[PDB]
Homo-oligomer: A and B are copies of this chain.
Amino acid sequence: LKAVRLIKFLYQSNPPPNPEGTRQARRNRRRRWRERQRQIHSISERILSTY
């Protein structure tokens, strides 16, 4: 309920940023994607692992 609403709310809180610049920040942007998806899945499995 509120748990899955939280998880999908954090999923939609990770938007794909605009591609612009001389490709410096894009690698940091990919790293931010992969990491933050990893701990949102971690929060999901912890929340559904207690229950």
Number of interface residues of A (CB under 8 A): 30
Q: Output the nearest chain B residue to A15 by Cβ-Cβ distance.
A: B50
CB distance from A42 to the nearest CB of B (A): 8
Q: Does A36 contact B (CB under 8 A)?
A: yes
List the 9 shortest-distance A-B pairs measured between CB atoms, nearest first: A4-B48, A41-B45, A39-B39, A6-B6, A44-B48, A4-B4, A10-B43, A41-B48, A4-B7
Known: A39-B39, A43-B36. A51 touches B8 (CB 8 A): yes
Q: Does A32 contact B (CB under 8 A)?
A: yes
CB pair A43–B39 under 8 Å, yes or no, is yes
Q: Does A13 contact B (CB under 8 A)?
A: yes
